[PDB]
């Protein structure tokens with residue numbers, strides 16, 4: 001299996017579909033862009049007045065501030081463990097889509113995109129690929145879009161134009 | 172100035188994505204996460220005591236085996252939540268895919284056991300900006316840009332599912 005790929009000096013069309021959509025960086029110096037909302041299902045629960053998103057390839061998960069994630073998870077029925085949030089494995093496949101409003105587009109993750117479905121049993125707990133992390137100034141407070149996001153959306157980091165481009169990953 | 176260069180990544184458990192770089196002459200190979208959330212190159216140093224758990228199961232860079240290594244020694248420190256990561260600056264030739272670049276990087280002499288002992292890779296290649304670089308060390312992608320070998324001043328990530 002091909003675990004992943006980084007291209008320097010371009011992109012690889014055999015691994016994404018359609019065309020890139022681009023968002024300008026807020027300020028040069030960091031791979032961070034403006035976010036205009038996070039929808040659970042079809043309602044904008046969070047970041048309703050805009051917030052920041054770090055596109056962080058060295059992070060495993062999607063992260064938000066403790067307050068934002070408490071709220072995200074409250075809406076998902078997920079239970080706070082020490083480190084992570086969990087759901088009863090049987091409800092995993094029924095978890096709502098989650099959307100990130102970036103540029104002109106919604107970037108939608110379904111339950112298969114963020115639930116570690118290690119079982120389908122009600123006696124078992126399944127982890128979520130979303131965690132709380134308080135990133136301190138100057139970078140944060142911010143969301144971080146890690147591997148959970150990048151898996152679904154092929155990402156281009158563009159230094160010439162100071163932008164980040166997203167296209168649908170082809171698996 | 173017409174090259175694209177790719178690096179195959181390994182997916183560990185949907186949480187760690189890493190590929191190979193080479194440091195020195197001859198190349199000492201290391202598995203590294205290519206990290207847009209940091210701007211430094213870090214690898215463990217042969218000078219990291221075996222009494223650090225994070226250093227005992229990872230590849231260690233040995234300057235005394237590299238003919239192209241240029242000593243620097245500036246102590247540098249990264250502040251992590253679980254403790255401090257510290258080491259010193261060295262320069263050597265770093266190969267990434269088909270690309271060779273002379274680069275300043277940190278050799279790590281101490282780091283918290285956690286999360287570092289849980290990494291399946293040995294170091295990190297920061298792909299962020301000089302602004303966030305510890306010691307304002309020129310980031311690797313800036314040294315690649317300066318070479319003028321790339322088709323475009325961009326890099327892209329594909330991450331598969333496991």
Ligand SMILES: Cc1cc(Cl)c(OCCOc2ccc([C@H]3CCNC[C@@H]3C(=O)N(Cc3cc(CNC4CC4)ccc3Cl)C3CC3)cn2)c(Cl)c1
Nearest residue numbers: 058059060204206208209213214215279286287290293294
């Ligand atoms: C063995 C080993 C590992 C490393 Cl990083 C290393 O370099 C020391 C440099 O230290 C660090 C530590 C953290 C960071 C974070 C900065 C922003 N992105 C996530 C990074 C992140 O969390 N990780 C660390 C990390 C991430 C994950 C993935 N999961 C966490 C949710 C991110 C798992 C383990 C580790 Cl240790 C950086 C990017 C690799 C950068 N550099 C050396 Cl010298 C030796």
Ligand SMILES: *[C@@H]1O[C@H](CO)[C@@H](O)[C@H](O)[C@H]1NC(C)=O
Nearest residue numbers: 242243244245260275307308
């Ligand atoms: C290490 O390199 C940096 C270059 O930015 C320099 O500031 C520092 O003086 C160097 N240390 C040495 C070799 O004295």
